[PDB]
């Protein structure tokens, strides 16, 4: 994606390493010529250009055609007419059937900014490169604005663990209109028992209630930071923790305690000084972190990446607790995704690991927007400043490391209710929900190796719990039209999953629409 | 609040300024004699101190009892047996009158860490400090776990333009439970539509819906700084943009063009040096900017600051928008809680600027959550990367300046369903709901202000459009009990709004409500 960014940021560094300016200072459109470097210096940064790249740049065309940095970028950003007839019809069959979604995508691109409508973009198949627009769903179904059924393997990014309005769910928003709810102003009448439902489920000791997984994620970095009076924060590369600005970034070359680079235009690395990128499972990275000591105001884990759900990384994790531990750092799982769905007491129970803060979301707004900060007192006193009693003389005892926070619209009265709701729900339902989930997410993924084994194709399914991606080699983003097309809906990030409303029927649909896509290009000239 | 660390901040520059270390340097705790201070920096210093603040420190504290920043701080910071037994007897009938909120409040501190717990506490009066919990709401009246009605100025912090549940809303949510509600994964059908509406209601270009107005704020940031290839960024002393760190600052003392200090523990520096916070309506302040010229990626100003409704600086405004546009710097207007308020078209159309980004939210959302950015292309294609069509060979031309932004419960179904009604209901309504429901706020304060003429109080009422606030030396902390207890429910933040659905008697019942409290403690010896 935001290649260029980073291709700048690498040079940027190749040359202040060799040539000791620092990088801070490294105009990105001065010609070379006037770095003043050595002729060793030109050939160490001609060879870090060779290794992480393919090219091989003669040192000639730094001072002639290439003169800058802007201009090495420019550069360094770089079918059959038997496909072609197979693509040609299907871009046909397709757009024909998703017409009213490219209609009111192209009506509404300019008045409604979104990002999604760029997704799987690509010059010469632009005519088929719009989001899917949904008019219904219900249980595992969705319907587009053409009136065409899809099996939903999406479930709103992870947020609709029970399928799309679930009985208890709906009854849940039908009593809301019937009871004259409390308002936003005064606190909730609710929100006291969501906590402590969330504490039995979960064994955290105190909960607080933002409005997204950003929000949960922005506010967990800013405790430990105001409880360790630290400020130093390493996350690791491929996790995915928010749009926050503090933790959008990505692994400064060959760095260990060397802060960030930013992941995208408009991320000042001003927002990169705090934070160190390393490595996932990889040991070296427990050293860096060992290495660092008393420095880490917190280590920001995603337990079990969204990325790679076959990385269930619990030897890293016990030993990334212990280091922690000892330096007094705050350990942060980012549990937004895996929370209340790999099991009732989410990441931490299944690796028998209990961090000093986590972060939910997603499932546990009961499809209303939701994040969630928790974890022990020693942290979230940072929140209110510590509990006290009346009848005593007691104080906020934290008071001097207390932070700020605030927001409008936390402990909504509705999603707190949604909230409370999935909660009780799921400890109504027992251990055997998940387990029935997970078994039959494990049934789906066997069953598509199986006839991926024994058929010889480039793809294999990886799964965690519920959550379950592809991993091929073939042109993903053609694939994934293809079961888009073939009614099996999958948002452009590719994380799937399946739901407790997930049938017999949709198992089998979803295991057959993939059967004949892998046919469908097999006879297109794609094996 | 957070003064400690405002404090720490001051002397950390004072010393770095009088002599010359960088204050990234100043161990807060090392002992003054380490410095190796001269005696004029040390009387310098010693001035500043005697300047900023009441104290005149004798310097011989520096190599005794206070011989570290630390102790200054803690030094730094710093009632008749008539009033006593009026306010011994009043915290007894409050308590009483409120004793459910108070008992859940004490049940629900640990499990529920919520800053709202801490709100006005003092040591001595703690056995009555607590936030009211609510159990229902309707129109203009909310009602307690207790069942005590009040008459609600606090209106979700300026949320409910209509009141509680006004029945357009309500018919909303119910239309949804019947309807299969779309999901959460794919594109919103109703989004579209929420923005062209907006488009006319405001005049903005494009328009990009986010999850809370911190978040919003947040985005606009990165956009400018995306578009201006720029980092820095000015906002306002008093101004209020959410609690995205990158805003969570300070007033570096006496600085111009000089990075900001962390508002409070947990805010890192770092985060801090691309932001310069300026007095606002101060003609120094536009020159700075202009000294700065083609610095400033953005300046981001509450067009009328939620603190000070009289500060209306039209002037400041309109000079404001001649700099930052031939500069090429992005102008952001914080709408969040004046846009659909003041009127249909919001601050922009009052003082009749057009800025190049606005943030939206609070009302927005008819009660639910909601953030909005929105403004010309030049920016907001910093989210897609520009328009584009189909059937020629177009492509998004700021594919380069494209940031990320993400979320996902963006455009939530329900969510993009309230905000629809809500403008279609500000449509079909005239002007006249705005002029109504200003003039309605204009009499409330004009006879307040009339009645604390003619009787020598010191209390004004402050206005602009329907939203309202005290301006009083007395201790506004006990008043605001004082009008809690009497059925007027103010939050601790004293932003205070009038709904279309506040009555003849409402209007009476609150300045009825002041009136009785002024005779309160008249006759307790407050005057
Ligand atoms: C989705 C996700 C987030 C961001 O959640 P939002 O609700 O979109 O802010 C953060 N962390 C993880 C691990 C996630 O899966
Ligand atoms: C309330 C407010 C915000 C923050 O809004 P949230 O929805 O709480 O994030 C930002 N700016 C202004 C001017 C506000 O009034």
Chains 1, 2 share one sequence.
């Not at 730094?62 to 038997?82: G, H, K, R």
Request: net charge negative; hydrophobic share 40%.
């Amino acid at each position: 994606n935001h290649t260029k960014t980073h291709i700048e940021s690498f040079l940027k560094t190749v040359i202040s390493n060799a040539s000791g300016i620092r990088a801070d200072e490294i105009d990105s459109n001065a010609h070379f010529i006037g770095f003043g470097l050595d002729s060793i210096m030109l050939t160490q940064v001609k060879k870090a250009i060779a290794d992480e790249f393919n090219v091989d740049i003669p040192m000639e065309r730094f001072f002639d055609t290439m003169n800058n940095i802007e201009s090495v970028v420019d550069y360094l950003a770089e079918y059959t007419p038997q496909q072609r007839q197979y693509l040609e019809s299907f871009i046909e069959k397709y757009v024909d059937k998703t017409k009213g979604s490219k209609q009111y995508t192209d009506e509404t691109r300019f008045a409604h900014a979104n990002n999604r409508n760029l997704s799987s973009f690509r010059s010469y198949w632009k005519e088929m490169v719009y989001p899917i627009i949904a008019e219904r769903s219900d249980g595992s179904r969705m319907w587009d604005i053409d009136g065409n059924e899809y099996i939903d393997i999406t479930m709103g990014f992870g947020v609709n663990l029970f399928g799309h309005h679930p009985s208890f769910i709906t009854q849940t928003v039908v009593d809301s209109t019937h009871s004259a709810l409390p308002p936003l102003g005064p606190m909730s009448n609710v929100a006291g028992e969501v906590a402590d439902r969330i504490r039995a489920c979960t064994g955290v000791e105190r909960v607080a209630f933002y409005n997204s997984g950003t929000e949960a994620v922005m506010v967990a970095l800013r405790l430990a930071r105001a409880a360790t009076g630290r400020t130093k924060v390493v996350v690791f590369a491929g996790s995915y923790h928010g749009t926050f600005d503090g933790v959008l970034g990505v692994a400064n070359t060959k760095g260990g305690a060397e802060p960030a680079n930013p992941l995208a235009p408009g991320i000042p690395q001003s927002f990169m000084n705090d934070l160190i990128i390393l490595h996932y499972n990889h040991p070296d990275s427990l050293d860096v972190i060992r290495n660092l000591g008393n420095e880490l105001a917190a280590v920001l884990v995603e337990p079990v990446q969204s990325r790679r759900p076959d990385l269930q990384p619990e030897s890293f994790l016990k030993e990334l607790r212990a280091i922690t531990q000892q330096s007094g750092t705050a350990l942060i799982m980012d549990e937004i995704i895996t929370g209340f769905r790999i099991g009732l007491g989410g990441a931490q129970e299944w690796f028998d690991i209990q961090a000093d803060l986590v972060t939910y979301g997603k499932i546990i707004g009961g499809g209303q927007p939701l994040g969630i900060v928790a974890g022990k007192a020693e942290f979230m006193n940072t929140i209110d400043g510590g509990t006290w009693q009346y009848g005593d003389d007691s104080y906020p005892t934290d008071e001097a490391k207390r932070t700020f926070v605030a927001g409008t619209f936390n402990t909504h009265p509705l999603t707190m209710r949604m909230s409370l709701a999935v909660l009780r729900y799921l400890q109504a339902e027992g251990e055997t929900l998940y387990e029935r989930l997970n078994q039959k997410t494990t049934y789906l993924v066997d069953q598509l190796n199986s006839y991926f084994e024994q058929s010889q194709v480039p793809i294999r399914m990886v799964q965690f719990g519920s959550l379950f991606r592809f991993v091929s080699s073939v042109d993903n983003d053609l694939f994934f039209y293809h079961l888009n097309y073939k009614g099996v809906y999958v948002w452009e990030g590719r994380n799937c999953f399946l739901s407790t409303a997930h049938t017999s029927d949709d198992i089998a649909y979803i295991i057959q629409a993939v059967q004949e896509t892998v046919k469908d290009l097999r006879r297109g000239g794609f094996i």
